[PDB]
Paper text:
The Omicron XBB variant likely originated through the recombination of two BA.2 descendants, BJ.1 and BM.1.1.1 a progeny of BA.2.7516. The recombination breakpoint is located in the receptor-binding domain of spike, and each region of the recombinant spike confers immune evasion and increases fusogenicity. Recently, the XBB variant emerged as a recombinant lineage between the second-generation BA.2 variants BJ.1 (BA.2.10.1.1) and BM.1.1.1 (BA.2.75.3.1.1.1; a descendant of BA.2.75)16. XBB harbors the substitutions R346T, N460K, and F486S, which were convergently acquired during Omicron evolution (the mutations in the non-S region are summarized in Supplementary Fig. 1). XBB.1 is the variant most profoundly resistant to BA.2/5 breakthrough infection sera to date and is more fusogenic than BA.2.75.
S ectodomain was reconstructed as two closed states (closed-1 and closed-2) at resolutions of 2.50 Å and 2.51 Å, respectively. Comparison of closed-1 and closed-2 showed that RBD and SD1 in the S1 subunit rotated at the hinge, and NTD also slightly shifted (bottom). There was no major movement in the overall structure of the S2 subunit in the two closed states. However, some differences were observed in both the S1 and S2 subunits in detail. As a major difference between closed-1 and closed-2, the cryo-EM map around the fusion peptide (residue: 828 to 854) was highly disordered in closed-2 but well observable in closed-1. This suggests that in closed-2, the fusion peptide could not adopt the stable conformation observed in closed-1 due to the movement of the SD1 domain. In closed-1, S383 of the RBD interacted with the main chain of D985 of heptad-repeat 1 (HR-1), but in closed-2, S383 and K386 of the RBD interacted with the side chain of D985 of HR-1. As a difference in interprotomer interactions between closed-1 and closed-2, protomer 1 F375 in closed-1 was located in a hydrophobic pocket formed by neighboring protomer 2 V407, V503, and Y508, and stacking interactions between protomer 1 P373 and protomer 2 H505 were also observed, while F375 in closed-2 was located in a hydrophobic pocket within the same protomer formed by V407 and Y508. The cryo-EM map in closed-1 showed a higher resolution, and the RBD was well packed, while that in closed-2 showed a relatively lower resolution in the RBD than in the whole map, suggesting that the RBD region is mobile. This further suggests that the loop containing F375 is trapped between protomers for packing in closed-1 but is flexible in closed-2.
Numbering used by the authors:
A (entry chain C): 753 to 802
B (entry chain A): 554 to 620, 639 to 677, 689 to 828
C (entry chain C): 854 to 1051
D (entry chain A): 903 to 1139
The structure:
Amino acid sequence: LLQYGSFCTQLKRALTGIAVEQDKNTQEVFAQVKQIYKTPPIKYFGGFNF
Amino acid sequence: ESNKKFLPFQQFGRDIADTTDAVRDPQTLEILDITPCSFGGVSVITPGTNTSNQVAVLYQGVNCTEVGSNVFQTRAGCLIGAEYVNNSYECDIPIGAGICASYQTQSQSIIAYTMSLGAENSVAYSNNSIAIPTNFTISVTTEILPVSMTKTSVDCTMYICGDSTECSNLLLQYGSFCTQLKRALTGIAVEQDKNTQEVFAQVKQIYKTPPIKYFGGFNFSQILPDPSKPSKRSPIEDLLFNKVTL
Amino acid sequence: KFNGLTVLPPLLTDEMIAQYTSALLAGTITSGWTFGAGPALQIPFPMQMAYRFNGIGVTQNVLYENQKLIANQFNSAIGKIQDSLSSTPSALGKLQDVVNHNAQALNTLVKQLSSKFGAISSVLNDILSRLDPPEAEVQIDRLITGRLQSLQTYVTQQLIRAAEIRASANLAATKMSECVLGQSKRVDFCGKGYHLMS
Amino acid sequence: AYRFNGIGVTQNVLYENQKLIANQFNSAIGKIQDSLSSTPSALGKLQDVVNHNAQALNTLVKQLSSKFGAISSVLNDILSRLDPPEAEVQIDRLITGRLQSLQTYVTQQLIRAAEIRASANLAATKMSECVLGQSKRVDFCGKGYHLMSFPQSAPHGVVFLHVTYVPAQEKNFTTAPAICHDGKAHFPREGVFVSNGTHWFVTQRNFYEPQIITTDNTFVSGNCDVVIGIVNNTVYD
Ligand SMILES: *[C@@H]1O[C@H](CO)[C@@H](O[C@@H]2O[C@H](CO)[C@@H](O)[C@H](O)[C@H]2NC(C)=O)[C@H](O)[C@H]1NC(C)=O
Ligand SMILES: *[C@@H]1O[C@H](CO)[C@@H](O[C@@H]2O[C@H](CO)[C@@H](O)[C@H](O)[C@H]2NC(C)=O)[C@H](O)[C@H]1NC(C)=O
Ligand SMILES: *[C@@H]1O[C@H](CO)[C@@H](O[C@@H]2O[C@H](CO)[C@@H](O)[C@H](O)[C@H]2NC(C)=O)[C@H](O)[C@H]1NC(C)=O
Ligand SMILES: *[C@@H]1O[C@H](CO)[C@@H](O)[C@H](O)[C@H]1NC(C)=O
Ligand SMILES: *[C@@H]1O[C@H](CO)[C@@H](O)[C@H](O)[C@H]1NC(C)=O
Ligand SMILES: *[C@@H]1O[C@H](CO)[C@@H](O)[C@H](O)[C@H]1NC(C)=O
Ligand SMILES: *[C@@H]1O[C@H](CO)[C@@H](O)[C@H](O)[C@H]1NC(C)=O
Ligand SMILES: *[C@@H]1O[C@H](CO)[C@@H](O)[C@H](O)[C@H]1NC(C)=O
Ligand SMILES: *[C@@H]1O[C@H](CO)[C@@H](O)[C@H](O)[C@H]1NC(C)=O
C-alpha cells in the first residue's frame, strides 16, 4: 500500500476538518452570551407561567 | 467465557457486521467469546516551541490500566504528563468532554482542568423597579470575509503523457473525461470572477471627496486614500496587504 | 469497536448546553432585549410585554386592560406544547435522520470489508497461511484497490453531508440571534403572525 | 443626528455632545490599526485559502512521482529501454493513477468553490445592508445598536468596520405603569414614568432626561380602576 502514495494524509485532513467544523458549529450556535444569568428565587412575573 | 446457547450442531458465531465472535473448543465442548485487543490513537499536547519543550500524551478511548502525574482517566481516554486541578479557567487547548489543558506557572507546568462557561451574574429583578442608562460609548469593530480564490487551468496531454505520442493514443481510448475537467475548471474561474464583480461593483458612479477635509470634527484620514503613496491606498489597507503574504 | 473506526466525543457536554440555554432564558426573562446589546437592565415583565405590543402597532392600554386574559392564553398555549410534541409521530424526524444516515454509512463501510474484488478470498490471514510472497501480491492488490475506493466514497459522502449541516447550523445561529435577543419585523421569520418573543 | 434618531435617541443628545462623540470615534478608529497589528491570527481566514490552494497544487505535482506498480515513473526511460509491444502494460497503470489524481483534485476544487461562493454571497449581502443603509437586525452589522459601516479591500477578501452605540452608567429608578389623576388614567406617549424618590417625571428610552408630566406627552384612554399597580399624582397643563 505504501507504493500508492499519500491518499491517507488527505483522508485524515478531511476528517479532522470535519470534526473541527462540527465543534465550531455548536460553539457558534450556543455560546452567544458571556454572562451566566440566574432567575430570582421568587417565580412571579405578573401572572405568567414559565 | 460465553453465555451463548449453542445448539448441538453449530461451530462458529457471527454478528450483524458478519465477523466471528464465538467459537467452541474441539477437544472439550465449551463456548468461548472472542474480543479484539485494545487499540487506539495517540495525540500530543504541547505549547509553542518558543515557550517550552514539555509535552503531554493522550491515548484516545483507553483505560489507563492497559498502558508521577501520568495517571488521570478522562472520558476521552488516558492522559499522561498533566496534572488536574479543581480550578476553572477559559479553555486554551481542547481535549475532550469539557476538559482543557494549559501551560501555567503554578514552576511552569502543564495542567488539565474543566472549562468555565463565564462569570456568574444575577440581576435583581423587581416588579416596581427599573434601570436606566445615563451615558454612552461609541465602539468600532472589524469583520473579515473572503470573496474569491485562485483560478487554475490544467492540460491533460502534458500532465499525463507529456510529449509521448503512444501515451496520447492510449489515453484517447478512455473517453472524454478531459472535456468535463476543462468545463468544471472554466466554470470555477468564471464563478470566481463573478463573485468579486457582485461584491464590489455596487455603485455605477465614481464619487470623490471634497478637497477640504472638515466634517464637524470627525477624522477619516485612516480610511481615506493616501495620495503620497503610489498605489493610493489607505494606511489600514497598507497594513492589511502587508500582513497577508504567501 | 470496528476495524480502525473510532467515534470522538464532543467538546461541550449536554449539561453545558443546558446551562447556556438556562442563562439565555433568564436573561431574556429578566432584562428583555437589553442584555443582547450591552449591560443587562432590569424591567418588570408586564411593562416589557406592553413595549413589545407597542412594537407591533398596538397601544399599551390594550395590554394593561387585558393582562389576565393574555396570561391565561399564554399559559394554555404553553401547556398544549408538550402534548402536541408527544402526540405527533414524526415531529422530530430531522434529528433522527442524521443518526440514521451516520449509522447506515458506518454499517455500509464495515460490510464492504467482506467483498473479494475478484480474489481467492477476502481474508488476509488465509492468503498468508496458504501461500507464499511471490503469488500473494496479485490477490492483495485487488483488495487494496477496492478498500481504497470504498474509503474515498465514504469521505466524499461525509464532506457532502457536512456542507449541508454547516448551512443548517448557520441558519440556526442567525435565528437565535434575531428572534431570541430581539424582536424581528421580517415576515414569517420567527413564526406565523406578528412576532412577540421566542 | 438622524442616525441617532433611527435608534431611538433624540437629536439634542447629539447636538449637545458633539465633541465627546467625535473624540470617542477618533480614539476608536485609532485603536483599530494597533488591534489588527497586535493580533497574531487576525487574518487567518484569508491565509487559509492561499494555504489550501498551495497544498493542493503541491500534492498534485508530487503525485507524478508514483509508479503505480510499474517498472518506472518516467515515460522517457520506458521508451528508450523498451519497444511498443510491452510498453502499454506499464503505461496503462500510470495513466489510470494520474486520471484518478486529476479527478480527485477537480472534486476537491468544486467542493471548495461552493463554500467560497456562499461566503461571497454573505459578504455581498452585508455590504448591501450595512454600508448603504442602517440595519435594525440584531448582531448583523456589529454588536450593539448599529450606526454605520466602512468597507476596506484586502487580498482575496473584504473588511467591514462597524460603528455601534453602547449604553453605560445605569441607575436604579422606581417606575409605574400609569398615573391616576381626577379619576382618569394616564399613559406616556413615548418613554416611561420615573421617580427619584419624591417626585415623578417621564423620560425617554436609552438616555436619562426627566421631564415634567404634562398633557402634551400623555394620553388618557381609560379609567383608573382597571390598571394594576397604578400610582396617582398631579398632572399639569
Ligand atoms: C404553573 O404551571 C404548572 C404546570 O401546570 C403548575 O404546576 C401544577 O400545579 C398544580 C397545583 O399545585 C398541580 O396539581 C399540578 O400537578 C402541577 N403540574 C405539574 C406538571 O407539576 C404550577 O402550579 C403553575 N404555577 C402557578 C403559580 O400556579
Ligand atoms: C460619559 O463618559 C465619558 C467617557 O468617560 C466621560 O468623559 C470623560 O469624563 C471624565 C470625567 O471628568 C474626564 O476626566 C475625561 O477626560 C472624559 N473623557 C473625554 C474623552 O472627554 C463623560 O464625562 C461621561 N459623562 C457623564 C455625564 O458622566
Ligand atoms: C486626523 O488623525 C491623523 C492621525 O492621528 C492626524 O495625523 C497626525 O497629525 C499629527 C499632527 O500634525 C502628527 O504629529 C502625526 O504624526 C499624524 N499622524 C499620522 C499617522 O500621520 C491628523 O492630524 C488628524 N486630523 C486633524 C485635522 O487633526
Ligand atoms: C478500568 O479498569 C478498571 C479495572 O477494574 C475499572 O474499575 C474501571 O472502571 C475501568 N475504567 C473504564 C473507564 O472503563
Ligand atoms: C475539586 O475542588 C472542590 C473544592 O472544594 C472539591 O470539593 C471537589 O470535590 C474537587 N474535585 C475533585 C478532587 O475531584
Ligand atoms: C410583585 O408584586 C406583588 C403584588 O401582588 C408583591 O407581593 C411581590 O412582592 C412583588 N415582587 C417582588 C419581587 O417584590
Ligand atoms: C439597581 O438596583 C439593584 C438592586 O438593589 C442593585 O443591585 C444595582 O446595583 C442597582 N444599579 C446600579 C447601577 O447601582
Ligand atoms: C426629585 O426631583 C424633584 C424635582 O426637582 C426635587 O425637588 C427633589 O429634591 C428630587 N429628589 C431627590 C432625592 O433628589
Ligand atoms: C391616591 O392614592 C392613595 C394611595 O394608594 C389612595 O389612598 C387614595 O385614595 C388615592 N386617591 C383617590 C382619589 O382615590
